């Protein structure tokens, strides 16, 4: 029946993500995309008791693997938007992995493992540009990036923060799904158009 | 409304020191984030960028000419002025002022120019 | 400083046809040119900045393209009113540099 089944068929929101984050020369963040599309698509599939029978890693791997593949999906998206140079880049990658990895292990159901992340990278993104403002004499990313990609980008962060950590209060079976959909959107919307670095 | 209004000598002998003034309208420098360039194109040649000032009066200069470039301005009377020294034959010009804004730093008014030119 | 090129000096242009102003950069100036049309004898308007945005009052007959060193200005259906000369300015840096500017003309 569908109202088990559509936490595992929604799981499909973050295809358009990887297919989008490949054609845009993001291979990284493609990796991390497909590897969090796999491991949410597998938590909700040993879920559901439609379907549960299928599936071939143990609970505690998938629960972890799909909350921190979710966690770091939320942190290249946005070192993806700063765009660092070398050996910068690199350096503030590894840092969300490593935070992301140790902060999932000690409490994954604790939201911290979302805000800490999100919060660093909104703090290491205001530096950077705040910096680049007081540079330029101007508003640093043009008006454009403002009303076309960070300002839909966070308005579907709102959203899918708002749909897991309050409405699942009311629902797991919709709004969950429609969480994969409102997080699938900022991943796609906080990617630059291209890979300054690749293209 | 926004408006700019170049003025000058128009005529003067090589080897002397001229102050240019731009007059500004529709808005005021004192504005945060507001910026006035001041733009010059040689007879015959393409356009060239000269100076800048701004809201903080933080000041710029194109680093060919830095050596003979001072601008200074007074919002009282809503006002830019560009002085050049040494003045030369390469100076033969129109001299244009131009507003730049925060959110686009293209400037985006100019005022019509004004004709400077060295002769005896 | 930044050398700014326009591959056309001067391009002659049929009265309703198109156009391609190409523009080249000494280095990567990260899209911020921007593009203007000098009227004889007057004040030049800003048509075009950040590549590609328009300015509120254009027609959108004007459009810009390009990234990385390599810019694009192209006017659609060319008025009698477009023949004028269009300069790009480079202005990733506060030491701003101008094009060399293209003289458009009717063909």
């Known amino acids: 029946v569908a109202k088990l089944l559509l936490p595992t068929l929604s799981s499909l929101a973050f295809l358009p993500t990887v297919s989008i984050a490949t054609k845009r020369r993001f291979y990284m963040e493609a990796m991390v995309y497909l590897f969090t599309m796999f491991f949410v698509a597998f938590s909700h599939a040993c879920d559901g008791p439609g379907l549960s029978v299928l599936c071939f890693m143990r609970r505690d791997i998938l629960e972890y693997f799909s909350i921190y593949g979710t966690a770091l999906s939320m942190w290249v998206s946005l070192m993806a938007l700063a765009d660092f140079d070398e050996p910068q880049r690199s350096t503030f990658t590894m840092l969300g992995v490593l935070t992301i990895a140790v902060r999932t292990f000690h409490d994954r159901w604790g939201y911290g493992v979302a805000s800490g992340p999100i919060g660093t990278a909104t703090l290491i993104i205001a530096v950077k540009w705040l910096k680049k403002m007081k540079e330029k004499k101007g508003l640093y990313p043009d008006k454009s990036i403002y009303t076309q990609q960070i300002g839909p980008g966070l308005c579907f962060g709102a959203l899918a923060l708002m749909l897991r950590f309050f409405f699942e209060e009311w629902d797991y079976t919709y709004v969950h799904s429609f969480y994969h959909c409102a997080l699938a959107m900022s991943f796609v919307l906080l990617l630059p158009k291209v890979n300054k670095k690749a293209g | 409304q926004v408006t700019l209004k170049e003025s000058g000598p128009g005529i003067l002998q090589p080897s002397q020191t001229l102050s240019l003034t731009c007059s500004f309208s529709?808005?005021?420098?004192?504005?945060?984030?507001?910026?006035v360039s001041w733009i010059r194109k040689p007879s015959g040649k393409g356009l060239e960028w000269l100076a800048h000032?701004?809201?903080?009066?933080?000041?710029r200069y194109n680093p060919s000419l830095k050596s003979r470039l001072t601008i200074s301005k007074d919002t009282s009377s809503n006002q830019v002025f560009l002085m050049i020294t040494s003045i030369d034959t390469a100076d033969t010009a129109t001299y244009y002022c131009?507003?730049?804004?925060?959110?686009?730093?293209?400037?985006?008014?100019w005022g019509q120019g004004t004709s400077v030119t060295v002769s005896s | 400083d930044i050398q700014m090129t326009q591959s056309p000096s001067s391009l002659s242009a049929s009265l309703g046809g198109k156009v391609t102003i190409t523009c080249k950069a000494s280095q990567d100036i990260n899209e911020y040119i921007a593009w203007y049309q000098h009227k004889p004898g007057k004040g030049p308007r800003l048509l075009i900045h950040?590549?590609?945005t328009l300015q509120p009052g254009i027609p959108s007959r004007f459009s810009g393209s390009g990234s990385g060193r390599d810019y694009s200005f192209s006017i659609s259906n060319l008025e009698p009113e477009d023949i004028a000369t269009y300069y790009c300015?480079?202005?990733?840096?506060?030491?701003?540099?101008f094009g060399g500017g293209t003289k458009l003309e009717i063909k």
């Open positions: 950040y590549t590609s």
């Open positions: 300015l480079q202005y990733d840096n506060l030491l701003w540099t």
């Open positions: 131009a507003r730049r804004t925060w959110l686009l730093h293209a400037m985006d008014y």
């Open positions: 529709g808005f005021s420098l004192s504005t945060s984030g507001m910026g």
């Open positions: 000032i701004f809201w903080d009066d933080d000041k």
